[PDB]
């Protein structure tokens, strides 16, 4: 368009495709943390980092859950934030009259001559 519409600019028109990494990143970050923490545990205790994999599996399980649990909370959180902002724009159209897009041919800026 040629019309700087705040609402339509904000509206979830889409065009946001998650990566193969986009959702998976948190699970393979928290689990990687917990696994590394268990290796950290054995490293300081002078125990084999491999040894006692029950600690590593449990750390992985808890972390994975939290990342998935918290990924969910964010997505709800972000959705609500958009809802309020769209609501406030709809509430005060007078405060945010839709603005018109122009082109450089209609403007005069000041440049910097290196010379």
């Amino acid at each position: 368009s040629a019309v700087n519409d705040p609402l339509e600019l904000l509206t979830n028109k889409g065009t946001h495709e998650p990566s193969f990494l986009s959702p998976i990143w948190n699970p393979i970050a928290c689990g990687v943390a917990g696994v590394g923490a268990a290796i950290f545990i054995n490293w300081g205790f002078r125990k084999p980092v491999f040894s006692g994999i029950q600690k590593h599996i449990a750390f992985g399980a808890i972390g994975v859950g939290a990342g998935a649990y918290f990924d969910q909370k964010r997505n709800e959180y972000l959705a609500k934030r958009d809802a309020v902002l769209r609501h406030y724009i709809e509430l005060h159209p007078d405060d945010f009259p839709v603005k018109e897009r122009k082109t450089y041919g209609q403007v005069l800026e000041s440049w910097v001559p290196v010379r």
């Binding site: 959180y77 609500k80 934030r81 309020v84």
Partner: protein
Amino acid sequence: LRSKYYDHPDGEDAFGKIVATNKYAVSAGVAWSMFDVLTLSKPQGYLPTLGRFAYNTGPLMGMATAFTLTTLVATNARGKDDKINYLIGGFAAGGVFGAWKHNHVAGLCAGLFLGIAGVIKKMSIEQGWEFFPNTPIKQYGGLNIAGNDWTIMADPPKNWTTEKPKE
């Protein structure tokens, strides 16, 4: 008593101007004075205590007056209001600092420093910004800030309604 240094032209009402500064000068002077008389000097008696307060306050009067008059002198005669004007203002202030401190090097270096201070101060006065502007935003919590209630008393209905008048 109640005047503003920076609410007038940069070359007018010297006396009112210095007063609007000297108040913000004396505040620091006596403020440090009560702060240190009880820590280091601890001079038993009231005249000795008057001495420490006098020793502390006078020099800061010297600093403010020296800065003000030199810079006021500039605009009166140099006829302009420039960053350089406050720079000579700061040079004079630290020259007074060296004079009282009886440390020639310490006064001169601070005089350069105070000139930088005045330079930045003039930049604020002339570029329409401020060091400690009031806040444009003051937040009180997440979006669910209204939803973080966990109380367990039943609330009977309200006496007010958002709905439009029905007359």
